[PDB]
Amino acid sequence: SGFRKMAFPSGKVEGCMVQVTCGTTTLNGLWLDDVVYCPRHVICTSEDMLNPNYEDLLIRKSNHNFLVQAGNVQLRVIGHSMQNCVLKLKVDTANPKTPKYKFVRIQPGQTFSVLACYNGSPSGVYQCAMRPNFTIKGSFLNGSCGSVGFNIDYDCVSFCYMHHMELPTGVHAGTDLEGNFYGPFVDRQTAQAAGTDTTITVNVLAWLYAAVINGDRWFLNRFTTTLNDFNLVAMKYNYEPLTQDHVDILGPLSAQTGIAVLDMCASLKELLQNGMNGRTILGSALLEDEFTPFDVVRQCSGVTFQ
């Protein structure tokens, strides 16, 4: 036992990272089959970003202007095109390391792993979640744009995110692999502010289920509640309303533990009202919301990937 914020093994995605340089800008790209995906702002300069017209900035570029390096070998670019906020560079070699993969657009509250990269070289891996206000709370220095978020199922990598920018508040915005941003964010430097960072209540309960499975049970109480009562409390603490679909996704953890979902909501409610009183749950002194119900089951079941 033990429960930890665990990322997916990163090897399969490490094999797709490449460096992309246009003019003076270098960032990362993702090499899948014979196509290299990267943020389109690689073609921008520093003022270019105040109010760029990418359609016009790309007119000045040709295939030979995009220097793509995979490890120490240069890749040949035979085509380029813009799709939403991403450029797709067609190279003349298929990546030999391409895993089986899919492109998916995730929902707020879902989690995924990030392989932070600089200059096409991996730096580290950590788990993140798509926040209800559509930002992620990552770790990104300059040059990390183009690093991707992903989940792995069996032997299929589902890419879900590509990094594009940092708000003045230090949180992060990006796109899916079709180039569409999560949320209202745009790839220009402007007054962009994030909405409320509401907590993903269904992940919190999942994590409370994890704790009981992993021996922490002090928060369990003699009470129960209803969805309509619970939700008055979640609305007061800036929590996502809990829904019947969520109660349903929590069924399996409820079955394995024998603790009814609504009794667990009653545990969460008292914790919101009274705090933890200086105690801890799974090593944390605050309620954790970046573990989905699939993530607790997966980690508590030892699911592996081939």
Add this chain to the structure above:
Amino acid sequence: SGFRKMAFPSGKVEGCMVQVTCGTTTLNGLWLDDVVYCPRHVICTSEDMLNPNYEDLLIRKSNHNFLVQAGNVQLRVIGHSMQNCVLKLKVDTANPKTPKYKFVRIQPGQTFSVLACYNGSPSGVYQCAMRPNFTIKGSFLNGSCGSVGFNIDYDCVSFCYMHHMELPTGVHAGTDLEGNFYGPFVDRQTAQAAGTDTTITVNVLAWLYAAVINGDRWFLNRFTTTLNDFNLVAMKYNYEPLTQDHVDILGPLSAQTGIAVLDMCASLKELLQNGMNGRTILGSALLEDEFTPFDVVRQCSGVTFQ
């Protein structure tokens, strides 16, 4: 910016994981060059573990009894030998994926990443630290024995840990790659209890330096202290005494931030005495001690690995 508990990319180690079965027991092994390392308790049954005599249990084994599978291909075992608590199985093929690597025995307070594996297949990766009482607080289900902890420098993997067992308290014990356990723990089921889980003060300050670099500065105050005063406080809160070598390792973060190490200790001191008052630092409501000073510099500098 942003600061997160980041693991090392796991691809290089994913290429060394293999399944090891002796009789009915399956666990993981590490395939480096032509040798496969795994816990010696793979040769034990269930009662065998109360007070095993591995010397005698191994006398009953031969090379053909150790079934080593790498992905879907079986490996041929041409030799086996015990070194402390690990068995070394010599196979007739060198692993083609062997990275450059080293075996190191770490010091308490040092951190490393774990690639949790089941049946020779990776499941996830997370960062851990060797605790002052020589246990690690991991995530391990049955079948995870043999998963390794590691750090990567440049393109050299320094293996530092191999998982072997769980104490009744849910914390974990293991060995280095030479087969010697960290701490007093032995590979038998007995009354083994962990000593105090003291906090690694030099990592805490490192993380306080990370927070200031990442915009959290509310804990900074108008005070300073001395090592001898500070240490009276660390001793009262079950913190490791801070030493001059530690002040020295913190120099670079002190230089980059302009906050004197002893002023930062004065910040840590008030936090120990008054608590955080319901606020948070780098997203945590408690003081984090599993980031070493090298880990903050590395993550805040974008160091990558080839």
